[PDB]
Amino acid sequence: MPHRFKVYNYMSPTFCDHCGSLLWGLVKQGLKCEDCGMNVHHKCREKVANLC
Ligand SMILES: [Zn+2]
Ligand SMILES: [Zn+2]
């Protein structure tokens, strides 16, 4: 099954689970998958294997 990513407002300095880099910003810094919890950049969404 595919991931179900949803824009998320990170609070704690959080890193992308795909590319390893920090999720920059105050709000809406990245996507958290609603089913498995994985955090990714908006730009890294298309870059991850879509098996959740
Ligand atoms: Zn997932
Ligand atoms: Zn990333």
Residue numbers in the entry: 229 to 280
Q: What does the study report here?
A:
Effector proteins translocate to available DAG pools in the membranes by using conserved homology 1 (C1) domains as DAG-sensing modules. Herein, we report the high-resolution crystal structures of a C1 domain (C1B from PKCδ) complexed to DAG and to each of four potent PKC agonists that produce different biological readouts and that command intense therapeutic interest.
For structural studies, we formed the complex between the C1B domain of PKCδ (C1Bδ) and a synthetic DAG analog (di-octanoyl-sn-1,2-glycerol) in the presence of DPC micelles. The structure of the C1Bδ-DAG complex was refined to 1.75 Å with Rwork = 0.214 and Rfree = 0.246. Each C1Bδ protein chain has a DAG molecule captured within a groove formed by its membrane-binding loop regions. DAG binds in the groove formed by the protein loops, β12 and β34 and can adopt two distinct binding modes: “sn-1” and “sn-2” 26. The “sn-1” mode is predominant in the crystal as it is observed in six of the eight C1Bδ chains. In both modes, the DAG glycerol and ester moieties are anchored to the C1Bδ binding groove by four hydrogen bonds. The fourth bond involves the amide hydrogen of Gly253 and it is this bond that defines the binding mode. In the “sn-1” position, the acceptor is the carbonyl oxygen O5 of the sn-1 ester group, whereas in the “sn-2” position the acceptor is the carbonyl oxygen O3 of the sn-2 ester group. A particularly important feature of the “sn-1” binding mode is the involvement of the alkoxy oxygen O2 of the sn-2 DAG chain in the hydrogen bond with the amide protons of the Gln257 sidechain.
